[PDB]
Design a protein around this motif. Structure first.
Motif, PDB file in Angstrom:
ATOM      1  N   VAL A   1     -89.429  11.521   8.397  1.00 53.75           N
ATOM      2  CA  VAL A   1     -87.910  11.627   8.232  1.00 53.75           C
ATOM      3  C   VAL A   1     -87.366  11.073   9.496  1.00 53.75           C
ATOM      4  O   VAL A   1     -87.697  10.390  10.403  1.00 53.75           O
ATOM      5  N   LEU A   2     -85.913  10.888   9.296  1.00 51.34           N
ATOM      6  CA  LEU A   2     -84.996   9.967  10.066  1.00 51.34           C
ATOM      7  C   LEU A   2     -83.703  10.553  10.189  1.00 51.34           C
ATOM      8  O   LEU A   2     -83.302  10.783   9.016  1.00 51.34           O
ATOM      9  N   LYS A   3     -83.151  10.855  11.376  1.00 47.94           N
ATOM     10  CA  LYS A   3     -81.649  11.214  11.497  1.00 47.94           C
ATOM     11  C   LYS A   3     -81.131   9.798  12.413  1.00 47.94           C
ATOM     12  O   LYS A   3     -81.612   9.632  13.464  1.00 47.94           O
TER      13      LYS A   3
ATOM     14  N   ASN B   1     -76.708  12.639  16.217  1.00 48.14           N
ATOM     15  CA  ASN B   1     -77.174  14.104  16.637  1.00 48.14           C
ATOM     16  C   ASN B   1     -78.803  14.224  17.095  1.00 48.14           C
ATOM     17  O   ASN B   1     -79.333  15.290  16.845  1.00 48.14           O
TER      18      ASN B   1
ATOM     19  N   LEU C   1     -87.708  20.747   7.716  1.00 50.48           N
ATOM     20  CA  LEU C   1     -86.340  19.751   7.138  1.00 50.48           C
ATOM     21  C   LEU C   1     -85.085  20.331   7.557  1.00 50.48           C
ATOM     22  O   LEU C   1     -84.191  19.516   8.070  1.00 50.48           O
ATOM     23  N   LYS C   2     -84.840  21.625   7.506  1.00 47.22           N
ATOM     24  CA  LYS C   2     -83.350  22.258   7.895  1.00 47.22           C
ATOM     25  C   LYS C   2     -83.116  22.147   9.262  1.00 47.22           C
ATOM     26  O   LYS C   2     -81.830  21.857   9.923  1.00 47.22           O
TER      27      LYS C   2
ATOM     28  N   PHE D   1     -84.582  20.012  11.431  1.00 45.36           N
ATOM     29  CA  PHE D   1     -84.425  18.783  11.675  1.00 45.36           C
ATOM     30  C   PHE D   1     -83.221  18.007  11.529  1.00 45.36           C
ATOM     31  O   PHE D   1     -82.619  17.532  12.391  1.00 45.36           O
ATOM     32  N   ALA D   2     -82.519  18.594  10.337  1.00 43.57           N
ATOM     33  CA  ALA D   2     -81.160  17.941   9.990  1.00 43.57           C
ATOM     34  C   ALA D   2     -80.019  18.715  10.774  1.00 43.57           C
ATOM     35  O   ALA D   2     -79.239  17.872  11.038  1.00 43.57           O
ATOM     36  N   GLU D   3     -80.182  19.636  11.025  1.00 44.00           N
ATOM     37  CA  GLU D   3     -78.999  20.270  11.700  1.00 44.00           C
ATOM     38  C   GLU D   3     -79.176  20.894  13.185  1.00 44.00           C
ATOM     39  O   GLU D   3     -78.089  20.919  13.592  1.00 44.00           O
TER      40      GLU D   3
END
Ligand SMILES: O=c1[nH]c(=O)c2nn[nH]c2[nH]1
Ligand SMILES: O=c1[nH]c(=O)c2nn[nH]c2[nH]1
Ligand SMILES: O=c1[nH]c(=O)c2nn[nH]c2[nH]1
Ligand SMILES: O=c1[nH]c(=O)c2nn[nH]c2[nH]1
Ligand code: NA
Ligand code: NA
Ligand code: NA
Ligand code: NA
Lengths: 295, 295, 295, 295
Positions: free
Chosen positions: B151-153, B156, B216-217, B219-221
């Motif tokens: 994963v990557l963001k 944030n 996932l949630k 990591f994203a939030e």
């Protein structure tokens, strides 16, 4: 002795670019690995230790980053064409640029059923690639591909009626597993230069999507007589849907899954109609290729 | 000299199983790689060349196939428990079985918006794994995991306020890329044997799904203060949602993406707020681990 | 929830060092990949977003380079001990350092029968490794290993007299191929600190050489009754030759080479005494482990 | 649409062969990975599902084993020529065979200074390869190569006098590390058929040895002006020593080792003449190619 051919450049240049929409707050990422090899009047670097003709590979690396900063990196056919054209225009003695781009998947995450503005997942090892050859006075040749698309169907594959002689042990079959890693390449008609490539920009993503969709649907729906017959059906369809493509090439391994006879153990039935457990074979593998063009 | 520890078995056993629904015509495939290592009263095979105590590794391979033929292979926690129990019950002198299973993704294809009955795609290199240790008189210990979730963001993520001394060059940051490959393991409370494992079967798939969704949630939030802080939040949530889990362990690399200063070239601005093009770093990488348990 | 265990650091730090003899002109190179993970009073970085307790992984990377500049990097047992000790002494709240080093082969080239002063070949993928655990108040624990040593003997391996039951299909044999990749680890007695490690410096290279020599000679000369029996002989000898070693562990795959029955083709004889052509098997493989200690 | 090109066969066929000298008791092993792809009048298998023209890939696999049983497998140029010729002679409608062979190293062990009769070590990942194209009516084209030969020199490499413009940041240097993985291919003059290949058998091993020796000596001894200049010197020499070679091609990555400036830490000097510790770079890498032929 004489230099018959020479090319040199930088390989394995990893590049990431982010686009930030100020209005919506949505970010989009692109990640690629780039290779650029140059040809031209460079023989003396080999024969006479004349480095004056060498655009340093380090400078090629810098150029890739600068070009990515100043231009769209999508579709990769366009970025590759811009990058290649740069080298032949900038350097009088460089006459060809060969650009290979591998695009890595960063797919936007869905969190609670909605697309996330800045989070991504590598949802597959499948790649989208381009090879762009920019040759001074000869235009731009582009080969687009997808690779690393791994699929399996558990039935609706057959293989019978092949040649049988004293080298043959393979039994005919009317029901087998078929699994492959798809490598599919479509070659565009030669473009005269950047203006022409720019004129066709919308066709690049659309043709990639079509090639992928045709590959998946044909694989899933064809009651396959052989890998050969199924792959031809795929290629025929792609050529029908995009007139600017000259040829389509597929290269497909046949990744074998073998039946396991368990009858030696308490008469257990695990072959033919009773086959449930199979042994995937790492090697060897069949390898089937074809290039399809227009009549 | 004396044998202090010994184990032996078969590694890298690839197994495929197909389930065929006769009513609907729908087929479902499972593919795994299995390792089974045994321990027991086997020291004399090492010290005295006494092969009579050896269940041949080839026989272990046969047993995996037979067991897959005669039992469900899903959820893998169950299959692993069945397989391990077999060895300790069948052989008087074998006292522990260690079973590792890696499950490979074969995701049903959607063709024209509908699920295909017998075609599948490897939609990710992400794995679901189990480690099952079956020890005579001591029950069944199961560690479930997911791995290879990349994963990557693009924003944030922050990292500031760390220790600064004469070894420090890292600049504090309030906006960076964060990318990792997630390896997450949840350890189940000890089970008394197969009957108990069977009693909890529905919890295995549900807990895997929960662990994935939470990862996932979060990591994203999370507006991440560090990899350390974000991973702890993930682990805390998993422990809250499944009481039969004793501990959660995460192992996360920090896959660095570096800014590229292009100011040397025509004053081009590509750092800080102007950063668009980055250089992904293959190595080195940060590596952050934690094991979270109950108070 | 509570943090039960935590460690963090930098992995995959590639390091090269050159030594230049000014008198003779001879140069010697060392190349390694280093991982350092730290433990200590760092839980609050996980639970409270308190980065003040974090020695940045980037700083750990810097420290590895600085330490390599200021100290010998050979033998790796010494370098690892120096590196680990640095972290526990420098930082009050760091109480353990875990250092893993993989040493890559750069073997001096022989050109026209004489050793070249500054040219090297990677003559094998075999590695020499160390794991050093430096724990405050508990000294220095060192495990030395070799790995990636790939060997094959074409005869003088047997495997008969194993357990036979309804799961067994393997035929007994008195002549087979044996091939493996050797992974051998020797664990040193605990050292009280750096002074003690320094006192034993000459023993590290000597013990590595002995372990390698014993492994090769035993493999080549033993008329092997099983992998189990041969590996025990290796371990016994190493323990006899170095009293400062507490245990020796071997982990050996059995890389199978299968006979190919060609009798279906013109009665061709290629099994048993007539076997000339074999099929190397990529998977599955036997895996045999043992840890040998002192009576 | 029409089939423009097609080929198919079996890839990744692992083969081992042992030779046993009955007089001396000495055994010699050969291990290879073989790929055979066929072309001919096979279009109808693609367009019409006509499998009658297909020699099954499984049969090709059988043929490789049978051919290895009945013929020498060394030198690989000969084995490849025999294998390719078989297919074009046996099958009327098959008109070309493309054979690729990778030879793996199994080097006889020296135990106590004497060569062991039946024990071997994989002393390098370096390969010896052949590509043999056997085309009906057009003879046999053979390209021999070595690959995976990894070398490093710590001094006596320079790179200065290259083109400098607004894309250039690389500093000129008169002393750097040079490291590469050598891929070298020599193309033989076309042979009329098997009899001619057989006539030249002794030249194959001798030319491989010469190419290897020239590569190593030139790398070690050349005070290199660039990768370009050094590789040309290698190619020139090979062409001089074997008149039956038409061209030599080298493909060399430039595997960069970067200086590390440590001056920020207590004024530590680790650049230029003081450089001792370097950071090997995994990517990107320079890539330099050239094909050298006769005047
Ligand atoms: O030997 C080299 N050749 C090149 O073309 C080059 N470009 N940067 N460094 C280089 N080194
Ligand atoms: O050496 C061996 N050890 C074993 O345990 C085994 N099992 N099958 N073949 C074997 N060979
Ligand atoms: O999230 C992070 N955690 C760390 O420990 C660290 N060290 N450098 N960068 C870092 N980022
Ligand atoms: O689809 C197939 N094509 C082939 O050429 C072949 N040869 N063996 N099995 C095969 N399957
Ligand atoms: Na030009
Ligand atoms: Na038991
Ligand atoms: Na401390
Ligand atoms: Na023919």
């Amino acid at each position: 002795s004489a230099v018959k051919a020479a090319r040199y450049g930088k390989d394995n240049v990893r590049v990431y670019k982010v686009h930030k929409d100020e209005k919506t707050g949505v970010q989009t990422v692109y990640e690629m690995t780039v290779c650029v090899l140059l040809e031209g009047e460079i023989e003396t670097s080999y024969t006479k230790a004349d480095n004056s003709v060498i655009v340093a590979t380090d400078s090629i690396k810098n150029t890739i980053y600068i070009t990515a900063k100043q231009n769209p990196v999508t579709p990769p056919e366009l970025f590759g064409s811009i990058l290649g054209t740069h080298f032949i225009e900038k350097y009088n003695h460089i006459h060809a640029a060969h650009v290979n781009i591998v695009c890595h998947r960063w797919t936007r995450m869905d969190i609670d059923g909605k697309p996330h503005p800045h989070s991504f997942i590598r949802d597959s090892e499948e790649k989208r690639n381009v090879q762009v050859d920019v040759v001074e006075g000869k235009g731009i040749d582009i080969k687009s591909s997808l690779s690393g698309l791994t699929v399996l169907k558990s039935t609706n594959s057959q293989f019978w009626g092949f040649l049988r002689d004293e080298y043959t042990t393979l039994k005919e079959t009317w029901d087998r597993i078929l699994s492959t890693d798809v490598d599919a390449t479509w070659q565009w008609k030669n473009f005269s230069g950047l203006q022409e490539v720019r004129s066709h920009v919308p066709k690049f993503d659309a043709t990639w999507a079509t090639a992928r969709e045709v590959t998946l649907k044909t694989f899933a729906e064809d009651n396959s007589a052989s890998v050969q017959a199924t792959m031809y059906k795929m290629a025929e369809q792609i050529l029908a849907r995009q007139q600017l493509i000259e040829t389509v090439e597929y290269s497909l391994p046949n990744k074998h899954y073998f039946e396991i006879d368990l009858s030696w153990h308490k008469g257990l039935q695990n072959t033919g109609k009773n086959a449930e457990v199979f042994a995937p074979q790492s090697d060897p593998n069949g390898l089937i290729k074809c290039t399809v063009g227009r009549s």
